[PDB]
């Protein structure tokens, strides 16, 4: 038994100007293998392994070049890995069909929840309520909640809360996110909406006054280019707003409206806000489902979508695409569009599930990797996973992506729809104080993200050593209090992100497993395996045995004492 398929990125992928070749094989039954190709013959060795298969690797510089791989067995066996017949030999294009983002690969990120994050201009703070989702929803009315930074949580925390945070503010902070290194910058929805996260979009084409103008928008845009800095913005096609005005036409129109075909209507006339008279994402009569399969409304989205990008952005986040209708004439439209206009750009769309589907060269970039950080990477410095599990659900992930998806990975543990790190690792509630404990384990989380491949997303505040539970009225996104700061976590994020940048083999796309011993998780990182994560999750220091050679710490020989809750990176 032995899968290997060129035309899948998973087998095939150019990643760091080289070209990646992997089979995947039954656990424990390949002593040794050899890519053997066209005057030409690299050995090769295995990177992942899960419950029940392994995958080997080897690399060689982007030249056309035929091949085919040389496997030798456990119990003494030699097979040649071809295809057909009339043609045994494999092909290589040389072609460039799924290029890596070099910017993406060597950045960091830092998601940016814009009410909640600083309010630099409080001028704009009222614009809010006129448009607001609870003054127009004729069914289940309500009034929205004005209040201060330090205010107290109130059930409208997750949306109809509004303290403030707007576009200027974040560009007074960008003096303190390049202290922290950020290079790229992933901003919440700011399109004109009716509510505090910004999900249900009135107009993709006109700014939101509570966040700002398109004047201070540009500065905030042009201020980050000098600092060379990228940013992403948030794209919501599937679903609207109910003040979106084609909406709001077929609100008093019927079909008597142009805009009948782009939405779900059941019952006609309806009152605003019914989910019952037409489809809206999980039955919210708030977010209308928007008709993606109608011709129409794809050219609109995937027109407003190329204003953003010719404005400034470098780069799109796509919410829910899994119920975007026709995904397949869709998102290869949107990627074909946007990738004209700028050929740099990241595309990241929102999947919080481990699927190589959108990110085969012809949809995304990456997915927001909610499957490797929050799925298994948090479980692990939990204390609870142990390190033969964590290795083994890792595999998973490094042997269904290609080398390039995971080296400009969206590497994300937390966001603004889920409970903070600090909070998930044992640290408290918000307005408790995080336990020392819980800090060990955040560093650990931290550091796990730094080190491997891709780009580390890190949401606002998490930096601050935060605390909040998304179960209590969304404490996650509490506004960030400037004048309290934990400067052991800030310093301690400050020291990674220029560690990653002092090593290259961090920033690489090449990742080797070593070994795990209960809660020990040890793994190379580089293209040569200069460089050696070994962390453990457990209260107990544990024993390992290092490979062979010595050692250089960087955040020695023989046997080593690997520390409880502690993460060693070593350097040869
Ligand atoms: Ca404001």
Request: net charge neutral.
């Given at each position: 038994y032995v899968e290997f398929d060129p035309r899948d990125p998973?087998?095939?992928?150019?990643?760091?100007?080289?070209?990646?070749?992997?089979?995947?094989?039954?656990?424990?039954?390949?002593?040794?293998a050899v890519l053997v190709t066209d005057h030409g013959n690299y050995t090769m060795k295995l990177q992942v392994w899960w419950d029940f298969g392994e995958t080997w690797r080897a690399e060689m510089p982007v030249e056309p070049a035929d091949y085919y791989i040389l496997v030798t067995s456990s119990d003494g066996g030699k097979f040649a890995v071809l295809n057909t017949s009339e043609s045994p030999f494999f092909h290589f294009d040389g072609v460039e069909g799924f290029p890596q983002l070099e910017w993406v690969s060597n950045g960091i990120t830092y998601q940016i929840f814009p009410d909640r994050?600083?309010?630099?201009?409080?001028?704009?703070?009222?614009?809010?309520?006129?448009?607001?989702?609870?003054?127009?929803?004729?069914?289940?009315?309500?009034q929205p909640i004005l209040s201060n930074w330090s205010d107290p949580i109130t059930p409208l925390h997750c949306c109809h809360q509004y303290f403030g945070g707007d576009i200027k503010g974040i560009t007074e902070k960008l003096d303190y996110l390049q202290s922290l290194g950020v290079t790229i910058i992933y901003i919440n929805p700011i399109f004109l909406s009716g509510s505090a996260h910004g999900y249900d979009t009135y107009d993709?084409?006109?700014?939101?006054?509570?966040?700002?103008?398109?004047?201070?928008?540009?500065?905030?845009?042009?201020?980050?280019?000098?600092?060379?800095?990228?940013?992403?913005?948030?794209?919501?096609?599937?679903?609207?707003?109910?003040?979106?005005?084609?909406?709001?036409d077929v609100w008093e129109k019927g079909n008597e409206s142009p805009y009948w075909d782009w939405f779900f209507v059941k019952k006609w006339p309806?009152?605003?806000?019914?989910?019952?008279?037409?489809?809206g994402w999980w039955g919210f009569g708030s977010l209308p489902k928007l008709n993606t399969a109608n011709q129409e409304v794809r050219e609109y989205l995937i027109g407003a979508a190329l204003h953003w990008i010719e404005f400034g952005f470098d780069g799109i986040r796509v919410d829910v695409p899994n119920e975007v209708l026709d995904p397949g004439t869709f998102f290869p439209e949107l990627r074909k569009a946007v990738k004209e206009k700028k050929p740099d750009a990241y595309l990241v769309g929102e999947i919080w599930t481990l699927s190589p589907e959108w990110v085969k060269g012809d949809r995304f970039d990456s997915l927001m990797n909610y499957a490797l950080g929050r799925d298994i990477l948090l479980n692990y410095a939990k204390g609870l996973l142990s390190g033969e599990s964590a290795m083994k659900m890792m595999g998973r992930?490094?042997?269904?992506?290609?080398?390039?998806?995971?080296?400009?990975?969206?590497?994300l543990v937390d966001s603004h729809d889920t409970s903070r790190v600090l909070t998930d690792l044992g640290g408290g509630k918000?307005?408790?104080?995080?336990?020392?404990?819980?800090?060990?384990?955040?560093?650990?989380?931290?550091?796990?993200?730094?080190?491997?491949?891709?780009?580390?997303?890190?949401?606002?505040?998490?930096?601050?050593?935060?605390?909040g539970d998304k179960g209590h009225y969304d404490e996650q996104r509490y506004p960030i209090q400037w004048d309290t700061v934990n400067e052991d976590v800030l310093n301690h994020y400050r020291a990674?992100?220029?560690?990653?940048?002092?090593?290259?083999?961090?920033?690489?796309?090449?990742?080797?497993?070593?070994?795990?011993?209960?809660?020990?998780?040890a793994f190379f990182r580089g293209h040569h395996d200069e460089v050696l994560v070994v962390a453990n999750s457990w209260k107990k220091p544990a024993l390992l045995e290092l490979p062979?050679?010595?050692?250089?710490?960087?955040?020695?020989?023989?046997?080593?004492?690997?520390?409880?809750?502690?993460?060693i990176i070593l350097e040869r």
């Open positions: 998973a087998y095939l992928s150019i990643a760091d100007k080289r070209t990646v070749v992997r089979f995947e094989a039954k656990r424990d039954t390949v002593e040794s994050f600083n309010n630099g201009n409080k001028s704009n703070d009222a614009l809010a309520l006129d448009h607001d989702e609870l003054i127009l929803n004729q069914v289940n009315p309500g993709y084409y006109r700014l939101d006054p509570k966040f700002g103008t398109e004047d201070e928008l540009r500065e905030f845009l042009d201020e980050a280019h000098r600092r060379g800095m990228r940013v992403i913005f948030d794209f919501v096609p599937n679903h609207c707003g109910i003040g979106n005005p084609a909406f709001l309806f009152k605003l806000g019914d989910g019952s008279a037409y489809v992930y490094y042997a269904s992506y290609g080398e390039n998806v995971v080296a400009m990975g969206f590497n918000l307005g408790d104080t995080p336990s020392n404990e819980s800090i060990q384990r955040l560093k650990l989380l931290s550091t796990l993200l730094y080190a491997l491949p891709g780009t580390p997303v890190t949401f606002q505040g998490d930096e601050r050593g935060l605390l990674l992100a220029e560690l990653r940048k002092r090593v290259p083999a961090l920033r690489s796309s090449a990742m080797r497993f070593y070994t795990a011993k209960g809660g020990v998780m062979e050679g010595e050692w250089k710490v960087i955040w020695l020989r023989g046997t080593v004492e690997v520390p409880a809750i502690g993460i």
